[PDB]
Amino acid sequence: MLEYQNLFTRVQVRTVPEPGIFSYLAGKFGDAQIGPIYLGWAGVLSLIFGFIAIEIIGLNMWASVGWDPVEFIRQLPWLALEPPPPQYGLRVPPLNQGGWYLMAGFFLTVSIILWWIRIYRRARALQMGSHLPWAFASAIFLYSTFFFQPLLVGSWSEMVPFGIFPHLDWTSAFSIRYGNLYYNPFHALSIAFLYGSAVLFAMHGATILAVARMGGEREIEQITDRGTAAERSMLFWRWCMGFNATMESIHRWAWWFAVLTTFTGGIGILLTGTVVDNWYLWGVKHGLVAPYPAQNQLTPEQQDLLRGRYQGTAPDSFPSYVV
Amino acid sequence: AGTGNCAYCHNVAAFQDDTLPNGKPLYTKIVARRMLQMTRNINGNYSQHVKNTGVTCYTCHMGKPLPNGLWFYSSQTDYLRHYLDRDGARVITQGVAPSNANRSSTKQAEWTYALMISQSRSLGVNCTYCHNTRQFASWREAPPARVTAYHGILMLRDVNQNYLAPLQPVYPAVRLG
Amino acid sequence: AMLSFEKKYRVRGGTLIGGDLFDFWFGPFYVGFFGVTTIFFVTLGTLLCVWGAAMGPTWNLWQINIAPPDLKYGLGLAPLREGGLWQIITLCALGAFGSWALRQAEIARKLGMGMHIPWAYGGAILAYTTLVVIRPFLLGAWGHGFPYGIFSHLDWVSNVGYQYLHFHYNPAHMIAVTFFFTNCLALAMHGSLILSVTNPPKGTPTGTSEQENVFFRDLLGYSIGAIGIHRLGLFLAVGAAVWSAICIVISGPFWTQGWPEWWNWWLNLPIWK
Amino acid sequence: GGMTEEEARRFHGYMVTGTLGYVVVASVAHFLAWSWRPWF
Amino acid sequence: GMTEEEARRFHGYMVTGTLGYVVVASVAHFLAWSWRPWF
Amino acid sequence: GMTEEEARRFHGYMVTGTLGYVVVASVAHFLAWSWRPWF
Amino acid sequence: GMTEEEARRFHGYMVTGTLGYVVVASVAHFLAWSWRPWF
Amino acid sequence: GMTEEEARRFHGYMVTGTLGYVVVASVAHFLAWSWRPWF
Amino acid sequence: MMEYIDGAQIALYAFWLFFFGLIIYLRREDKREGYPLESPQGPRDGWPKGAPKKTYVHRDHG
Amino acid sequence: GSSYQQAPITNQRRMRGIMIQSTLWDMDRKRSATRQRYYPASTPANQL
Amino acid sequence: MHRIWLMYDPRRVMVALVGFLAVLALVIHFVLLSSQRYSWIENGTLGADQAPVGASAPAAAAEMSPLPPGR
Amino acid sequence: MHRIWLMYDPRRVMVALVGFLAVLALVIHFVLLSSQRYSWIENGTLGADQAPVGASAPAA
Amino acid sequence: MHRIWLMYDPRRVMVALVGFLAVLALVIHFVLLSSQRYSWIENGTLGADQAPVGASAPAA
Amino acid sequence: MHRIWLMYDPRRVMVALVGFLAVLALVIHFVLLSSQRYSWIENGTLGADQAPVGASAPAAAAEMSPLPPGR
Amino acid sequence: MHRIWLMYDPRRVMVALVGFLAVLALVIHFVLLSSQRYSWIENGTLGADQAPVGASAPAA
Ligand SMILES: CCCCCCCCCCCCCC(=O)OC[C@H](COP(=O)(O)OCC(O)COP(=O)(O)OC[C@@H](COC(=O)CCCCCCCCCCCCC)OC(=O)CCCCCCCCCCCCC)OC(=O)CCCCCCCCCCCCC
Ligand code: BCL
Ligand code: BCL
Ligand SMILES: CC[C@H]1c2cc3[nH]c4c(c3C)C(=O)[C@H](C(=O)OC)c4c3nc(cc4[nH]c(cc(n2)[C@@H]1C)c(C(C)=O)c4C)[C@@H](C)[C@@H]3CCC(=O)OC/C=C(\C)CCC[C@H](C)CCC[C@H](C)CCCC(C)C
Ligand SMILES: CC[C@H]1c2cc3[nH]c4c(c3C)C(=O)[C@H](C(=O)OC)c4c3nc(cc4[nH]c(cc(n2)[C@@H]1C)c(C(C)=O)c4C)[C@@H](C)[C@@H]3CCC(=O)OC/C=C(\C)CCC[C@H](C)CCC[C@H](C)CCCC(C)C
Ligand SMILES: *[C@H]1O[C@H](CO)[C@@H](O[C@@H]2O[C@@H](C)[C@H](O)[C@@H](O)[C@H]2O)[C@H](O)[C@@H]1O[C@H]1O[C@H](C(=O)O)[C@@H](O[C@H]2O[C@H](CO)[C@@H](O)[C@H](O)[C@H]2NC(C)=O)[C@H](OC(C)=O)[C@H]1OC(C)=O
Ligand SMILES: *[C@H]1O[C@H](CO)[C@@H](O[C@@H]2O[C@@H](C)[C@H](O)[C@@H](O)[C@H]2O)[C@H](O)[C@@H]1O[C@H]1O[C@H](C(=O)O)[C@@H](O[C@H]2O[C@H](CO)[C@@H](O)[C@H](O)[C@H]2NC(C)=O)[C@H](OC(C)=O)[C@H]1OC(C)=O
Ligand SMILES: COC(C)(C)C/C=C/C(C)=C/C=C/C(C=O)=C/C=C/C(C)=C/C=C/C=C(C)/C=C/C=C(\C)CC/C=C(C)/C=C/C=C(\C)C(=O)O
Ligand SMILES: COC(C)(C)C/C=C/C(C)=C/C=C/C(C=O)=C/C=C/C(C)=C/C=C/C=C(C)/C=C/C=C(\C)CC/C=C(C)/C=C/C=C(\C)C(=O)O
């Protein structure tokens, strides 16, 4: 699309030899190799473990449509590799009843951890702060609660199924089971930071593009040697809303809002079914729930008649009614 | 059976007979006799569901021998068995803290959710017809239709267990699952 | 009070309306004509929210609930005690949000900046206007708007979702969620990269655009560049709100069944029907 | 980068015989299909 | 890229390899048809 | 790249390793067949 | 990179380690088969 | 990096630590076996 | 045996105390440029007081 | 249930996903896809 | 007609032609494979009279009154 | 016809061929395996007269 | 035919081969292990006379 | 045969090999641990005649139940 | 054998090894603690003759 700076409209340029003293260097910033996409030992291992995880998921999905490759594509978003049955709790389940699930979950988790090691080592080698590995750690924290919350309630059956629509079925059913997740205050906070991340990157993206013709996009120079582009960015927000960040500190606001999305998220999941089993009733207790006029009223006879039963096991027989 | 089609049920020379001249039973007449008892049982005992609208043969059959929505045994976890031999769909805890009273799985909430989509489609309504979805367990916040819906479950269990399912030996095999 | 470099920038000019009359500051804030109209709408709309709380059942902040009218009033103004007050507050909110964007355009003009910030904020205004004007208009009643209350609007979101049985299956909603999630990832990466070159381990020289370029290429396998990452953030953040506005405006006015059965077209493609 | 008219003449001869051979195989296939299970 | 001499030599292998593959597949179809005909 | 006699040397190993692999797989298949035929 | 003599030295260890590992696995399969045969 | 004599010096500790670890593990296993044998 | 106090409420105020501490920290970082403010009747620091202006050590190349 | 009896294999679903009956099979009635929903009949070779 | 290869680069056209034919051929086979009459993997050994035929028009008074299947 | 290899890089097209043939063969084997008649892993030991056949048109 | 190793770098071909053979071997074993007839971990000690076959029992 | 180490950097080969062997060994142990016949942690003390055979049925257990009692 | 430490920096191998062993030990302890037979925190004082055993085969 068209753009409000000339910079790459036309007369883009080719470094025919490498940049770093299009093309790329083959050399080192200190001891860090600069040419290929970095892996190291942890990157290589992460790809092997993660490949087998994805391969187990795909093969179980494909087996579930009876190996039919037409149905494998046609039905793909409905397919899943599913957690164990509830009766097993934390015991090892049968291979076709969640044993492959826990195996793929294990290999995926190791693959994620090894990818964090990779990023951590690469940040050190490039002589950079560890901000990015700890940002990624906050995402891993939320992910890990999909293991620890099932552990704390005592059943692998509560884990998230691997599958496009099936994991969204789980997301809805989790909120249904625990009495409406909107009344989980850490879910509410996690949304506040999720929305705030879109607010900040909209504001910051627009701000830097609004001064890009004055070099505002060269943020490292503007941080170390403040130009008029940084000054105008500070003054716009000060005049708009009464206060402002700096060119450096807006990236701290950005960092924390993103990080706090998954951090508060993880706490809300860990609290669910361990401390609070019905968040709406917790909302009533602590005064979150707005009153509405009653839509129906039960007699005492209906209060006993309309009590249900908690859901049990499926029938394992096909009864004849011959009589 | 279509108007004037007494031959669908009867040996039309001998309306009192429950068999053909060959001695083979007029299965359609034997079924229809049970369908009368079933219709009286619906209109009489399940007024909390059908009220003064009631049902007649036309409600299911609509001019045809086969009603819609016929179902048969398949999987154990088939949710339609809520209308036959199963009982209990509740999964929500009636208290703040976890307890031993409710140990329902998130898979059991998925099963209730599947069942409730079927009911919504069966009536062409959405969940808010019977619930305030801020708390699915609540009856006070739900419309009164939720109470009628519950009696519909109890009615179907009686209809299926006592009338439809025991007709198994009467039907020809082409009608069976 | 002023930043130690600020006074130099406080010139006249750049106003869209009103000339020099409102072209002045109040503390840190620039005023301008749309500053005046902002404070008018903010004050009126806020005081009517306080009145809505006063005539409601409680002062508890979480529980206050200023509901829209019944659907039977259609596109008319209800009695104020029956949702009409929600309608007046909605007109105040539209006036405030519009004034705020136009005031930002005056500020950007006065500093010689591009208009990017007003237009980005336009994406939020679009989503709001879709929720309370456009979708309720296409449905034929203002009562389809969401109530103004911190938790009572979450009850509205819940019930609107389940009006379509399984709102996760809404295709535009899946796109909007993907933008919101990818935006949060991109914000974490960009924030971390800038901070990690400007704040290296103790006793290490300050980093460079080359180091962040190299690290970003190791993360995504390509080099976005400094202008590109800000373009991408703006695209993701604003695109999220635009796809949000789409996903709600199609729900009801255009699609009325459950969202899962929308996917029937995919199952029926002739290559595999 | 180009194509001479003389080179095009040579290429076009192959292009025609390839197309014709393909059309012939497709024609035999359809008649096998038709005699197995006619669609009209 | 290739000289016409390379193209001439490559074509000889490429054609022979293609026809060898088709021959092997022909026996595979002969064996499959003998075991369970599809018409 | 590599020299043509160096490619000759490499090809001998590829052919040998392939033949070794095919031999092992042939014995594996025949064991499997004797254990539980699939036709 | 690596020299031919260095590659030859490495290959001796690499072959010997591979074959030693396969022997240990052969014994573990002997023990497993004796405890609970799978055919 | 290390010299080859430094690598030989390090290796003697590495072998010793590995042996010490295996010894402690073997005692731990024989205790576990005596408390509750798995075969 | 506390009826009203529960673990989720305890956690939430733990977060609030952290969060307001974070906002104080972020506003100190926001003030490393352009502060102290200028006004009549002299300089102004706002609240919280800003952290000092920050010098950055360049890489040598000689 | 006090104990579990296995269904015949032709009554066992290949797809373990819990909502699939409502979210897919309620609208999908392709014949080949319907057949794939259950495991096929399986018998010891003795009994053929 | 060979002048057409002066106007369009045969490197582009041969690739485009092969891609077009490959996709078309695949589409037609999968359409047929998903039909009932030409599901040839399952039913290819049926004779032409035995093969499925899609439903006709009612081809009658379109009003008829039924009789039960024999018990 | 060998001049076709002057138009197209033989290295690029030969890789494109092998990639195409591999995927095509895999699709065909899995189409067969998931059919009733050619589910040969489960039913390969059946004789040809015993193997499944899809439904005919309904008899008169 | 050793001149194909002039045409393609054996470093790339031999990696692509090993990758293809590893993935293919995993797929075939997973298919067999998911079958009834070759569920060999659970049933490998059954004789061929009583291993499962994908056919219905006789007499309807 | 040793010239394969001129062709590939052994520092990279050994990492990939160890990763491959680790993943393969872990897969096989978890496969066996999930089987009936070889669930050795629960049933390893059974004699070879007493160990399961058959039990290839896909649903050996009930899919749907409450969680075990939670004290 | 020692020349492996010229090929791989022992600073790194030792750290990788210690982490590998820690994760492996955690996995095995967790697998046992989750088991019925070896849930030693609850059942550790049971005698070997009293500890759970997985079901013997009816082979049905
Ligand atoms: C939930 C997750 C997401 C939630 C997301 C939440 C994000 C929150 C972002 C907003 C926070 C920053 C706001 C800010 O710094 O504004 C500048 C202003 C003044 O300081 P200054 O700018 O450095 O100096 C200028 C001033 O000294 C001289 O200026 P001048 O003479 O020209 O003008 C007059 C003065 C008069 O002061 C005021 O009028 C402001 C009084 C009200 C400030 C309330 C701030 C919000 C507190 C929120 C925390 C909590 C309060 C309970 O200065 C001004 O005119 C400045 C006008 C600034 C207007 C800012 C309005 C922001 C409203 C934010 C509403 C947020 C709603 C969520 O600062 C302050 O007054 C102090 C604020 C310090 C941060 C709050 C920390 C609270 C920690 C906990 C309690 C601490 C007790 C000691
Ligand atoms: C009916 C549905 C329920 C509901 C149920 C849930 C549930 C259940 C959860 C959330 C959660 C979240 N919900 Mg909610 N949610 C609802 C309504 C909403 C609404 C709304 C407008 O109505 C919004 C905006 C949100 C918003 C949010 C987010 C704030 C939060 C997720 C944070 C995040 O970044 O996650 C996205 C980020 C991640 C998942 C992190 C992933 C990181 C890992 C490391 C990535 C690994 C990738 C790997 C390498 C490769 C994978 C390969 C494949 C396996 C093949 N919800 C209603 C009430 N919501 C979560 C939460 O935190 O709750 C407190 C959560 O668990
Ligand atoms: C480079 C040499 C030529 C060649 C030269 C010959 C000669 C010469 C003869 C044949 C003959 C035959 N070839 Mg030729 N043939 C070639 C390529 C092929 C290809 C192919 C896929 O490219 C195929 C399917 C065939 C197939 C055939 C058969 C129809 C026939 C004998 C059986 C046979 O297959 O033996 C197995 C052979 C192959 C699979 C091909 C590869 C082996 C060599 C190149 C050919 C067999 C040589 C034969 C033993 C010579 C005997 C001569 C005596 C005087 C009798 N050839 C190559 C390109 N072929 C014979 C014939 O016409 O019989 C009626 C014959 O005399
Ligand atoms: C702060 C919270 C947000 C966040 C942050 C975040 N995520 C991150 C990071 C950060 C800061 C990273 O640095 C990290 C990253 O790498 O980013 C590019 C990551 C990441 N976030 C990811 C995803 C992700 N993040 C999400 C969300 C979020 N991330 C939050 C919104 C989501 C959502 C919303 O669901 C997802 C899906 C990944 C893209 C990435 C971590 C990648 C990773 O761990 O990969 C592990 C490896 C595999 C799964 C294996 C892949 C296998 C190949 C496909 C096989 C190819 C063959 C192979 C070569 C064979 C082997 C041969 C060997 C010899 C090599
Ligand atoms: C592009 C899409 C994203 C976006 C971007 C964005 N938002 C922006 C901007 C940008 C680029 C600004 O420049 C602008 C700004 O100045 O930020 C500091 C703004 C802004 N985004 C804001 C909020 C906000 N943005 C949100 C979302 C989004 N913002 C999107 C995700 C949300 C969500 C999802 O909930 C919120 C709450 C403000 C902080 C600010 C706009 C300030 C403004 O308009 O001020 C004038 C008006 C008032 C101060 C008060 C008006 C009071 C009313 C008259 C009465 C109340 C009516 C109201 C409807 C009641 C609702 C009650 C609730 C409980 C429902
Ligand atoms: C087949 O058996 C299963 C397992 O019992 C039945 O499912 C039960 O009921 C469901 C509500 C629930 O979902 C499920 O968890 C399970 O509890 C299924 O409905 C079929 O039921 C018939 O067979 C039952 C059986 O188990 O054999 C039988 O039960 C009664 O008889 C047996 C044998 O004497 C005895 O063990 C049971 O305790 C006994 N139970 C009761 C409640 O009487 C059913 O008979 C009756 C009257 O329930 C059968 O039901 C019918 C209508 O035939
Ligand atoms: C069908 O069969 C039932 C058999 O019960 C007949 O019912 C009889 O007549 C009813 C009026 C009465 O209520 C009932 O108790 C019973 O007495 C019914 O009428 C139909 O009858 C025809 O088929 C009969 C059948 O069973 O095959 C046949 O009955 C006669 O022949 C059988 C042997 O084939 C013998 O067992 C019966 O006892 C015998 N009955 C008599 C009364 O002769 C009927 O034939 C005759 C003559 O009645 C059939 O009726 C006709 C008109 O074809
Ligand atoms: C469920 O069932 C479904 C899936 C449905 C059914 C369908 C299945 C399908 C479609 C299958 C298709 C299979 C297939 C297709 O082609 C299979 C193809 C198989 C092939 C080709 C195997 C080839 C193996 C070759 C090997 C192992 C070679 C080893 C070489 C070695 C060891 C030597 C290395 C070099 C050395 C040592 C020294 C060099 C010298 C140097 C460097 C010097 O000197 O410098
Ligand atoms: C799903 O299945 C499930 C259920 C999980 C089951 C299956 C499990 C499986 C598959 C397990 C596999 C296990 C395994 C595979 O190999 C396990 C392999 C284990 C190994 C190799 C352990 C090795 C340990 C070695 C140690 C501890 C060494 C310590 C050394 C020390 C202390 C000395 C350091 C040097 C010093 C101090 C000198 C400095 C001098 C210097 C510098 C100088 O002098 O210069």
Ligand SMILES: COC(C)(C)C/C=C/C(C)=C/C=C/C(C)=C/C=C/C(C)=C/C=C\C=C(C)\C=C\C=C(C)\C=C\C=C(C)\C=C\CC(C)(C)OC
């Ligand atoms: C031939 O190759 C093929 C064609 C098969 C390759 C193709 C594959 C395809 C098409 C794959 C498709 C994959 C898709 C679509 C995947 C979708 C995945 C989604 C959407 C997943 C969403 C959420 C999943 C979550 C949150 C899972 C979390 C699991 C966790 C945290 C599990 C942890 C397990 C641990 C830590 C340990 C387990 C082991 C035990 C319990 C024993 O502890 C030691």
Ligand SMILES: CCCCCCCCCCCCO[C@@H]1O[C@H](CO)[C@@H](O[C@H]2O[C@H](CO)[C@@H](O)[C@H](O)[C@H]2O)[C@H](O)[C@H]1O
């Ligand atoms: C070597 C570790 C193997 C672990 C597996 C179990 C032990 C099996 C082998 C034990 C015997 C020693 O094994 C043998 O060691 C010698 C050196 O000592 C290696 O010898 C290798 O390096 C030496 C120089 O150091 C060269 O001269 C020789 O040509 C080369 O093969 C052999 O490659 C290996 O076969």
Ligand SMILES: [Fe+3]
């Ligand atoms: Fe930036």
